[PDB]
Amino acid sequence: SDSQQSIKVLEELFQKLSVATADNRHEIASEVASFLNGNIIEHDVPEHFFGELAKGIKDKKTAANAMQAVAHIANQSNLSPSVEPYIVQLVPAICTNAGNKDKEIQSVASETLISIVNAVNPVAIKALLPHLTNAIVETNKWQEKIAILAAFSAMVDAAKDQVALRMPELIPVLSETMWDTKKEVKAAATAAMTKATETVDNKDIERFIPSLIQCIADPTEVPETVHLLGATTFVAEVTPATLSIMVPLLSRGLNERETGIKRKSAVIIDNMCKLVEDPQVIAPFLGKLLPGLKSNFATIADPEAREVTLRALKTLRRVGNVGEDDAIPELSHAGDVSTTLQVVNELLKDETVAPRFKIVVEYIAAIGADLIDERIIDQQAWFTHITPYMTIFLHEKKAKDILDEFRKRAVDNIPVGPNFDDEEDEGEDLCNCEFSLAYGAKILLNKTQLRLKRARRYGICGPNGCGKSTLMRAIANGQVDGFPTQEECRTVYVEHDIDGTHSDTSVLDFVFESGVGTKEAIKDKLIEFGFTDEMIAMPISALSGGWKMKLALARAVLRNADILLLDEPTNHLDTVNVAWLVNYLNTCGITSITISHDSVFLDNVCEYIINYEGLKLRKYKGNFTEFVKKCPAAKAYEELSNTDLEFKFPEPGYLEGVKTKQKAIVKVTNMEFQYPGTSKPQITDINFQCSLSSRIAVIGPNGAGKSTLINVLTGELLPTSGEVYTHENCRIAYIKQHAFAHIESHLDKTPSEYIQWRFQTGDRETMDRANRQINENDAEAMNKIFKIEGTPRRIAGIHSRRKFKNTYEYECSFLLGENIGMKSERWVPMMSVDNAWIPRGELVESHSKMVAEVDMKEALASGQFRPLTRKEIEEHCSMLGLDPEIVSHSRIRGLSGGQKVKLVLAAGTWQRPHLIVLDEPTNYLDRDSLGALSKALKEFEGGVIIITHSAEFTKNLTEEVWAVKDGRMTPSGHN
Numbered sequence: 001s002d003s004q005q006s007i008k009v010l011e012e013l014f015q016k017l018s019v020a021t022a023d024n025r026h027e028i029a030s031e032v033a034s035f036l037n038g039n040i041i042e043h044d045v046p047e048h049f050f051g052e053l054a055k056g057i058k059d060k061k062t063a064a065n066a067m068q069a070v071a072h073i074a075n076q077s078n079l080s081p082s083v084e085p086y087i088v089q090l091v092p093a094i095c096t097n098a099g100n101k102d103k104e105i106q107s108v109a110s111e112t113l114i115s116i117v118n119a120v121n122p123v124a125i126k127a128l129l130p131h132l133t134n135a136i137v138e139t140n141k142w143q144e145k146i147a148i149l150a151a152f153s154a155m156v157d158a159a160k161d162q163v164a165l166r167m168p169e170l171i172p173v174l175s176e177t178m179w180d181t182k183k184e185v186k187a188a189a190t191a192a193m194t195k196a197t198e199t200v201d202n203k204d205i206e207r208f209i210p211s212l213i214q215c216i217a218d219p220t221e222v223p224e225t226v227h228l229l230g231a232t233t234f235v236a237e238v239t240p241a242t243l244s245i246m247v248p249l250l251s252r253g254l255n256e257r258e259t260g261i262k263r264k265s266a267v268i269i270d271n272m273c274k275l276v277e278d279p280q281v282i283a284p285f286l287g288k289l290l291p292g293l294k295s296n297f298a299t300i301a302d303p304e305a306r307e308v309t310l311r312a313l314k315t316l317r318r319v320g321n322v323g324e325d326d327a328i329p330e331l332s333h334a335g336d337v338s339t340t341l342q343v344v345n346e347l348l349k350d351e352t353v354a355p356r357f358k359i360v361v362e363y364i365a366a367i368g369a370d371l372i373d374e375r376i377i378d379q380q381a382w383f384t385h386i387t388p389y390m391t392i393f394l395h396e397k398k399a400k401d402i403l404d405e406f407r408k409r410a411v412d413n414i415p416v417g418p419n420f421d422d423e424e425d426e427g428e429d430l431c432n433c434e435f436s437l438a439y440g441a442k443i444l445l446n447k448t449q450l451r452l453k454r455a456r457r458y459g460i461c462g463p464n465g466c467g468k469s470t471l472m473r474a475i476a477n478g479q480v481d482g483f484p485t486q487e488e489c490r491t492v493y494v495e496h497d498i499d500g501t502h503s504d505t506s507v508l509d510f511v512f513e514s515g516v517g518t519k520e521a522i523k524d525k526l527i528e529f530g531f532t533d534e535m536i537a538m539p540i541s542a543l544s545g546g547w548k549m550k551l552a553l554a555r556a557v558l559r560n561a562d563i564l565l566l567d568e569p570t571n572h573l574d575t576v577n578v579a580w581l582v583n584y585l586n587t588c589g590i591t592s593i594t595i596s597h598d599s600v601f602l603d604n605v606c607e608y609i610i611n612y613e614g615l616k617l618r619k620y621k622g623n624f625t626e627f628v629k630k631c632p633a634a635k636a637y638e639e640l641s642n643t644d645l646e647f648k649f650p651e652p653g654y655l656e657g658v659k660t661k662q663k664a665i666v667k668v669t670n671m672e673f674q675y676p677g678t679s680k681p682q683i684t685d686i687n688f689q690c691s692l693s694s695r696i697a698v699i700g701p702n703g704a705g706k707s708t709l710i711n712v713l714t715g716e717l718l719p720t721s722g723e724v725y726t727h728e729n730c731r732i733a734y735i736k737q738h739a740f741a742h743i744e745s746h747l748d749k750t751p752s753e754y755i756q757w758r759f760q761t762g763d764r765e766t767m768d769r770a771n772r773q774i775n776e777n778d779a780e781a782m783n784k785i786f787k788i789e790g791t792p793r794r795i796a797g798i799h800s801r802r803k804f805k806n807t808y809e810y811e812c813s814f815l816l817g818e819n820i821g822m823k824s825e826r827w828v829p830m831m832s833v834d835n836a837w838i839p840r841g842e843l844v845e846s847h848s849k850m851v852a853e854v855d856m857k858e859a860l861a862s863g864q865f866r867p868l869t870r871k872e873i874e875e876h877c878s879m880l881g882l883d884p885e886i887v888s889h890s891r892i893r894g895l896s897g898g899q900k901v902k903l904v905l906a907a908g909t910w911q912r913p914h915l916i917v918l919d920e921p922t923n924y925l926d927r928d929s930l931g932a933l934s935k936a937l938k939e940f941e942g943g944v945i946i947i948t949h950s951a952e953f954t955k956n957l958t959e960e961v962w963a964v965k966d967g968r969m970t971p972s973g974h975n
Contacts, residue, residue: 006040010049018056020065022104026072029065033072037080050086057093063105067094071112074119081388084120085360088127091116095135098144110147117151121388122159125370126337126363129155129166133173142182149177149185149192156195161376162385165337165369168281171196171241178216178245186216193245200236202481204438208232226253226264230750230890231441234268235481238275240282246272247285254292262296263305269293270312271443276319280331289316290326334413335372341365343409347402357393364389368410375414382407420449427453430489430563430591433482439470439894440750442886446615450480452563457585458593459602459624462612463637463928464881468595469496469896471617472565475593492561494552494568495741496897503541507531507551510540516558529554530577542675545737545920546572546702553581557588564592567897568923570601570949572702595898597922597930598950639931647879647932648939650912652692653858655727656806661975662693665727665914665943672721673708682708685968686722690915694943696971697954698962705964710736710947714917718771728851729858732766733913735947740901740919747893751882752873754892755907759868763859763911767852768844776845785817788836792817796829801850802837808850809837862942863911879936880906881929898924915943922950 013032020028036046056066073079074087094116097109113132120128136148152170156163163170174196177189190197190213203209208229215225246268253265269289276282293313300306316322321329333339344365353361367385371377382403390399422432430452437445444467452458460468474480476493501510511522526536530550540548549571556564569581582604585592593610596602602609602624609624610617611634620627620634628635638645655663667689674681682704690696700706711717714736746754758765776782785792799811813835815827840847856864866872874884881902892900901924909916916937922930930953937944937957946958960973 003040003042003044006035007046007048009035009040010046014049014052017065017069018052018062022064025065025068029069029072032069033075033078036073036083037078041082045082045086050089054090054093057090057097060102060105063097063100063102064108067097067105067108067112070094071108071115074112074115076118079119079121081121081124081392084124084389085127085392087116088120088124088131091128091131092134095131095139095144095148098135098147099139099141106141106143110143110150113147113151114154117155118158121385122162123367123382123384123386124360124363124389125155125159125162125166126366127359127389128363129170129366133169136177137173142180142185145177145180145182145185146188149174149188152192153195159367159370159385161371161374161381162367163370164373165335165340165371166366167196167370167373168240168336171239172244175241175243175245178213179248183217186213190216196241202235202436203479204233204235204436206232207440222249223261226261226268229264229268229441230894231438231443233436233438233441233443233890233894234271234275235436235438235443235445235447236275237277237436237447238272240276240285242272243276243282243285247288251288251292254289254296259300259302259305262300263302263308266293266296266305266309266312270308270315273312273319274315278331279319279321279329280333280336282316282320283328283331286316286320286322286326286328335369337362337366337369339413340368340372340406340410344368344402344406347406347409351394351398353393360389360392368406372410372414377407377411377414379404379407422451425453427456427591430454431483433480435481435483437467437470437474437480439467439896440886440890442883442890442894443615444470445617448615448617450610450617451619452591452593454562454591455589456591457605457607458591458610459606459608460593460595460610460612461602461624461926461928464902464925465883465886465899465929466612467896468612468898468926469567469900469924470894471896472567472593472595473896475563476565489562490559491563491565492556492559493565494556495548496567497552501540504539506537506539507543508536511551511555511558514555516555522558525554525558529557530580542704544572544702544704544707545740549573550577550581557584562591564588564590566592566594566596568595568597568920570596570598571920571923572706573949574701595924595926597925597927598952599927600952637928645932647936649909649916649936649942650940651862652914652942653729653731653855653862655692655730655858655914658691658727660691662691662943663727663730663914664689664691665730666690667725668712668722669725670722671712671719671724673712673717673719681967683712683964683967683969686712688962688969688971690943690945692914692942693975694915694945694960695958695975696945696960696962696973697958698945698947698964699949699951699954700961700963700965705967705969707736709962709964709969710919711738713945714738714766714770715768716770718768718773718775729855730914731763731855731859731864731911732915732917733763733911734765734904734908735917735919735945737919738770739904743892743900743904747891750888750891751877751886751895751903751906752870752888754903755873755877755910756868758907759863759910762852763856763864764852765908767855768848769852773844773848778845786814786838788814788838792820793830794827795846798847798849799835801847801853804837804839807843808840808847808854810840810847810850811835811837859911859913862913866911876910877903877906880933881925882906898926900924902929913942915945916940917945917947919947921946921948922953923948 013035016028017032053066056062070087070090073083094109094112097105098113100106116128132148132151136145139145174189174193178186178193180186211225211228215221250265250269253261256262273282293309297306297309300309323329341362344361364386371382386403387399390403432451434447434449436447460471462468472493473496476491478485508519508523512519516522523536535547549569553569570578585605594606607623609620609627652663655665658665669687671686672681672684698710708717712719714732716736716738749757776784783794785794793814793816796813796815801808801810814830816830817827838846840850843851860866870888874887877887878884921933934957946954960971962969962971
């Protein structure tokens with residue numbers, strides 16, 4: 001009786017509802033809601049009421065009213081399981097209304113979908129999700145898609161564990177939606193799609209994510225975006241969901257005309273798919289990749305594109321573990337809805353589940369599959385989400401008993417989680433993370449660990465071009481996944497900072513504007529560090545490469561950084577402060593990571609070495625020397641004999657006069673320099689020569705005495721006085737810390753376009769281009785009176801050049817001087833007939849241009865002629881460690897300090913040079929590339945000036961020394 005009365009009340013309430021107006025709509029919707037959700041019917045449902053509601057939703061006149069009722073019925077805290085499934089059954093119709101021309105109906109529908117998503121017992125997801133996926137895929141109204149996308153997003157927060165298990169089904173749907181022509185839909189899909197991705201815990205494919213999204217909006221940007229894909233540095237763990245959005249793109253890329261696009265597509269396919277862990281995930285996509293790759297391998301001629309295409313094909317077959325006839329391996333459903341579904345059906349085998357409840361079991365299976373993906377394993381979590389759907393067709397006790405068994409069996413499928421357990425620990429715990437580095441699409445690391453204790457010294461090692469600098473860059477800026485932020489563990493990068501300070505400001509106020517305390521506290525730490533009262537009063541520009549390094553090392557000490565970072569600390573440091581740089585780290589009691597070239601520094605400091613074998617980070621129990629005992633290959637990697645690696649620099653260019661080494665091709669004398677504004681010159685009485693056999697080494701203390709000496713060697717700082725001598729066609733292959741600190745203004749370029757930038761110089765870098773050369777009277781001296789055939793003249797402008805004895809002669813117009821010494825002193829320009837050639841000498845004060853065109857020739861004989869093509873740039877830069885796949889693909893920004901300076905030296909030796917200087921060779925490169933760089937300097941037929949502090953790298957290589965002292969410098973050694 002009381003139950004039948006309920007049917008009558010609902011009928012009266014519906015009558016009122018179908019008549020409601022936008023005014024009173026919400027009032028009765030509320031009435032229907034509060035009544036329907038109570039214990040109103042004894043073991044049954046208000047069948048006719050749900051039919052009226054459905055018929056009302058499909059009718060223009062009553063759609064708004066009826067949907068608003070459904071909205072109130074589906075409120076976040078009172079939706080009754082007795083009604084829930086009949087509400088979800090209405091979702092498809094509600095979706096259709098979300099695409100209705102009528103402004104009001106469309107709006108109410110959108111709102112109702114959100115309400116339902118937020119109201120269904122999280123565990124009943126499988127009953128609601130299908131309504132939403134089906135609605136968004138068949139509708140053509142873009143506002144309906146945006147509303148549903150918003151509903152998926154709310155789902156992630158309302159039922160995270162359940163949605164996680166639904167990802168392999170959701171992601172493909174979000175990916176398709178990102179390819180919708182409508183720009184507002186693409187943004188919304190990407191956002192959903194971002195909660196979705198958004199699960200991608202890094203920036204490897206965003207640093208490209210914003211570009212990829214922009215691309216979806218404007219597909220004409222695809223070509224360039226494919227290029228940029230330096231490479232994104234795919235680091236995470238490619239999944240199918242991801243696959244639904246990527247494959248359609250890559251499939252067309254494979255069938256594109258340009259071989260370059262076929263090649264780029266394969267590369268992306270290779271990198272992305274080797275992150276597939278379940279073959280069943282990629283199985284449905286294989287048919288859209290295999291045929292294209294097979295066809296391309298047979299059609300393309302270029303061997304590189306072929307190898308790339310073949311590599312991707314092998315990965316696809318492995319991942320892919322592909323079986324006969326290219327069958328994608330059976331997808332395990334251990335995590336998978338099919339896996340949890342099998343589990344619940346087995347647990348329900350002795351229970352008679354009516355056909356009408358099948359949809360609920362499936363819903364329950366979906367929820368469970370997501371809880372597992374979200375790693376939600378406790379009993380209460382499962383009771384919160386699943387029990388409410390189960391009591392739709394089962395008694396509470398039976399439901400709870402089966403539910404608890406379902407959870408245990410499902411959770412038991414979670415893979416081993418075997419990985420390891422840092423906790424045995426030591427530090428105290430500072431940072432534990434399984435990340436994937438990738439500088440500019442270039443993969444430096446592929447799923448590697450990196451734990452670190454408190455108050456324990458370290459030291460990253462390995463060969464050049466591996467990622468030593470980029471690893472340290474991600475440590476500070478916080479690009480490493482899992483790595484704690486600044487508030488939990490503040491850490492301070494050396495010299496790779498970005499500011500905006502001047503070149504007139506001193507050292508004291510430099511560390512002040514940052515806000516690192518007061519001047520009286522900063523000046524106390526500088527004097528103890530090494531800086532004298534004078535060096536704390538001079539500008540940062542006057543500081544050498546060493547004092548700048550000591551400054552940044554001192555700033556890290558002042559900032560109270562828990563993890564001091566040291567990028568090549570011994571740069572220009574004498575045997576006094578080096579022992580202190582160690583003596584201090586030994587008693588500070590603070591953690592630190594030190595990359596270093598001098599192995600002797602790592603001996604007195606670093607207690608734990610972190611190498612770089614291939615793409616990992618195998619840390620070495622005990623220190624580094626103990627690590628060598630267990631792993632003997634940690635000190636014998638590429639010195640196994642290797643024949644396809646050996647190299648020796650090209651022979652130097654021809655130089656007239658240099659009969660002895662070794663081409664003397666450079667003989668300066670009485671060279672003095674005084675920085676305008678001081679009181680005493682930097683250097684003085686500098687006698688030095690250079691041949692085509694130079695084995696000189698500037699082994700000494702940095703600063704004003706050593707830095708200016710070198711700056712005059714290459715020559716940025718034009719010497720004020722003293723004769724300079726440089727043999728003809730002598731290119732000084734780029735060396736100071738100039739461009740080493742100037743490569744910063746070239747991070748947007750790649751290692752290839754860096755060499756093309758300099759040599760587009762010019763050689764323009766070592767042809768007195770670096771200085772001024774604008775001193776003829778120089779000064780007021782440009783008006784030199786040349787006496788030709790008897791009368792006075794002045795050069796108005798040069799024309800060309802031609803061959804002459806030992807130098808050159810240029811066709812230059814003149815200015816005849818009539819009535820000189822009077823008051824009508826005027827120089828009248830001549831014609832194009834009275835022109836007369838004049839020698840270069842003793843050849844720069846009138847022929848700076850005619851000389852440079854010749855020096856640029858013999859340099860291309862021993863660039864300059866070496867062509868600027870990709871292949872020859874690959875087999876050249878690889879010689880100095882730099883991996884080819886990173887040379888013309890990943891930008892310089894992604895390259896660390898070990899790869900930044902590593903490239904600058906590969907650029908100068910391009911044009912097969914006559915003098916190869918090496919400003920701090922061990923500075924950035926560890927022992928790995930140092931052994932190779934050694935032999936290259938031993939089989940070279942040209943000059944070599946190794947500027948270094950490492951007394952162990954000069955062994956059996958360099959003899960002469962350029963040790964400065966109080967300014968002056970007398971070269972000793974021998975030959």
